[model samples]
Target: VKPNYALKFTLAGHTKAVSSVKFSPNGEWLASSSADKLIKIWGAYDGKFEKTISGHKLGISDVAWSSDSNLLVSASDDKTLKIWDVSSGKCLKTLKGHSNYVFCCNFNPQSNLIVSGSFDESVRIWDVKTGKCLKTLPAHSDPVSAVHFNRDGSLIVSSSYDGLCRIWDTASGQCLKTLIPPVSFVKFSPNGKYILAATLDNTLKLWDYSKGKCLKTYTGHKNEKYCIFANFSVTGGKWIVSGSEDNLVYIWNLQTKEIVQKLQGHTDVVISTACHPTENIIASAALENDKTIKLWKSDC
Candidate 1:
């Protein structure tokens, strides 16, 4: 059986393209980061506007939710990452160090740390509690596109335009594994067994990071123009969902490696896609021309 999704909400708030849309782990809040230099939080179930966090001096490139859903971290073009309090709408810490744009940031599972990839070709680790730089790895030769922590937060997986994806040992801040070619997007499976990567070849693939082997390849998505994000469906990773340069949202059957569904609505490239951590709901944030976020849901 397959989970089908229907467009449930079209949210408008950001004046510029929405760069990231994330569902808080507890299913309490949905957060969106924008090139307009703002972050907005909404009710997960009702899509009701809750708060707008403003502090970054430059446009935001990405945002991530903390474990309890009450806190989030945002990466910005100002070369910094900001931690925000959901309820108070305050920026708790302004992480500074990167010499160029901070492209991606993610909270560790324990919520005690955050990792960020930057245009300066560095992967940085920060202490969430103290807001101090913990480590800086000369990660890639080109700009870093994304960075993520594994389930137990013992390791970090990072991607870069250098055409390589590397895995690092959290304890030592060292690289342990590497994969070939440009990976605009890459995510560690929740179980931390595999990886979902969106490559510039207009494709997505599942990888066995243990040996750096391709387990499954998902095709028929346009991803060349920019770094398109792809993720696992909340329904136990049976499906892979992704955004496209063709203005479409693609979902693939994980086991069968078949294109199962295609969603259409965005008038521009769909660059970011986020799935609810506990529900079958998904969110897509589009490029400049679209400047909107759309939520999709599944019904029995």
Candidate 2:
């Protein structure tokens, strides 16, 4: 049987390991960071390389696009975070304060705020417009892997290599709640109703933010875990898209706590996975015999 959608495009150019890829909010552009110490912006629909921007002295860990999609923010092993002008292809500002590598970063959609998580075990919020460090929240004891803002833009949640997830109130630089299980990746439901926490423990957890309790746990993996990405499923939050270190991807049904479908193509460990901003298409990066990216779809 064939997959759901055809391979519209293949984004190929990075000579080094690509860590993460993100689509702009409106899905017009694609941003990817790599160990090549460079970041590239692609035309999302055509997979055309629009521009390649670089300023990092070391590998780039993560890249994010501003709400307007006019600015690009990236964190790198150079212990610096940079803001770039999407149109000018120039580094607008370089944020320096981290004692170690900056791992992950995100820009608030409703405000001019940029948050970066670092291997230095700290998260910093920057005023994108002024290039000023507004607030520095030091809470993690290990490398921070992911940081994201809730839909309301009033709260921020972060996860670290230390195996903990903390939700903080952005208005006050205070840690609001510490989730019990060690979380490697934590993302808010696209609708902003629930928080999905994926852990190295090989489990996907769903939490109700308003009630402050665990709602569900979806578990099924071989031995270890890699990365988890949570987006609304076709059945309306009934499922999520996740890739595992075991060289597998699963479409999980949250209501039944079961695997509805499994995608097998990558022979190496899947490092990152992303969905087309609007379509049912999916993409995953793998590292095994040869480093390559895989694309998948469903058969209707």
Model 2 agreement with the true structure over 1-300: per-residue lDDT tens digits: 222434455566777777777778777877778888888887666677888898899998788888888898999999999999989889989998889999888999774999999878999999998889899899798878789998878888888767778889998999888876446778788777788878777887888865778888877854244444555454223467677777776666767777777677766665667766665656665543424455554443
Candidate 1 per-residue C-alpha lDDT over 94-157 given as tens digits, one digit per residue, 9 for 90 to 100: 9999999999999999999999999999999999999999999999999999999999999999
TM-score of each model, in listed order: 0.98, 0.89
Error of 1 at 183 (Å): 1.2
Q: What is the C-alpha RMSD of each candidate to the true structure, in Å?
A: 1.1, 2.8
Best by lDDT: 1
Model 1: lDDT of residue 174: 85
lDDT, candidate 2, at 291: 43
Candidates' C-alpha lDDT: 0.89, 0.76
The whole-model C-alpha lDDT of candidate 2 against the native structure comes to 0.76
Give the clash count for each candidate. 2, 2
